[PDB]
Protein backbone atom coordinates (compact mmCIF):
# COMPACT_ATOMS: atom_id res chain seq x y z
CA UNK A 1 0.00 0.00 0.00
CA UNK A 2 2.59 2.55 1.11
CA UNK A 3 4.89 1.84 -1.82
CA UNK A 4 2.09 2.07 -4.41
CA UNK A 5 0.93 5.34 -2.82
CA UNK A 6 4.42 6.80 -2.95
CA UNK A 7 4.69 5.79 -6.62
CA UNK A 8 1.53 7.80 -7.20
CA UNK A 9 3.14 10.83 -5.59
CA UNK A 10 6.43 10.50 -7.47
CA UNK A 11 4.41 10.31 -10.69
CA UNK A 12 2.51 13.46 -9.68
CA UNK A 13 5.83 15.23 -8.99
CA UNK A 14 7.16 14.16 -12.40
CA UNK A 15 3.95 15.39 -14.04
CA UNK A 16 4.27 18.80 -12.34
CA UNK A 17 7.91 18.98 -13.38
CA UNK A 18 6.84 18.31 -16.96
CA UNK A 19 4.66 21.43 -16.73
CA UNK A 20 7.65 23.46 -15.52
CA UNK A 21 9.82 22.04 -18.30
CA UNK A 22 7.32 23.05 -20.95
CA UNK A 23 7.07 26.54 -19.41
CA UNK A 24 10.84 26.90 -19.63
CA UNK A 25 10.69 25.83 -23.29
CA UNK A 26 8.05 28.54 -23.92
CA UNK A 27 10.31 31.16 -22.37
CA UNK A 28 13.31 30.11 -24.43
CA UNK A 29 11.25 30.11 -27.64
CA UNK A 30 9.94 33.62 -26.88
CA UNK A 31 13.46 34.94 -26.39
CA UNK A 32 14.76 33.12 -29.48
CA UNK A 33 12.06 34.57 -31.71
CA UNK A 34 12.68 38.03 -30.33
CA UNK A 35 16.38 38.11 -31.19
CA UNK A 36 16.41 36.18 -34.48
Amino acid sequence: SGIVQQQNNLLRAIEAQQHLLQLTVWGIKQLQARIL
Partner: protein
Protein backbone atom coordinates in the same frame (compact mmCIF):
# COMPACT_ATOMS: atom_id res chain seq x y z
CA UNK B 1 0.64 33.27 -22.36
CA UNK B 2 2.53 36.43 -21.39
CA UNK B 3 5.69 36.85 -19.37
CA UNK B 4 3.49 37.82 -16.42
CA UNK B 5 1.32 34.67 -16.57
CA UNK B 6 4.45 32.57 -17.24
CA UNK B 7 6.02 33.76 -13.99
CA UNK B 8 2.90 33.07 -11.95
CA UNK B 9 2.55 29.61 -13.49
CA UNK B 10 6.19 28.83 -12.65
CA UNK B 11 5.45 29.83 -9.05
CA UNK B 12 2.22 27.80 -8.96
CA UNK B 13 3.82 24.57 -10.16
CA UNK B 14 6.91 25.07 -8.00
CA UNK B 15 4.72 25.30 -4.88
CA UNK B 16 2.80 22.22 -6.04
CA UNK B 17 6.02 20.25 -6.46
CA UNK B 18 7.38 21.26 -3.06
CA UNK B 19 4.15 20.07 -1.53
CA UNK B 20 4.18 16.77 -3.42
CA UNK B 21 7.83 16.10 -2.57
CA UNK B 22 7.27 16.92 1.11
CA UNK B 23 4.43 14.41 1.13
CA UNK B 24 6.74 11.98 -0.68
CA UNK B 25 9.43 12.40 1.98
CA UNK B 26 6.87 11.66 4.71
CA UNK B 27 5.82 8.56 2.78
CA UNK B 28 9.44 7.49 2.41
CA UNK B 29 9.80 7.67 6.21
CA UNK B 30 6.73 5.52 6.68
CA UNK B 31 7.77 2.93 4.14
CA UNK B 32 11.19 2.60 5.75
CA UNK B 33 9.60 2.09 9.18
CA UNK B 34 7.10 -0.39 7.74
CA UNK B 35 9.96 -2.38 6.22
CA UNK B 36 10.84 -3.65 9.72
CA UNK B 37 7.37 -5.13 10.20
Amino acid sequence: MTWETWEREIENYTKQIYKILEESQEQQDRNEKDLLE
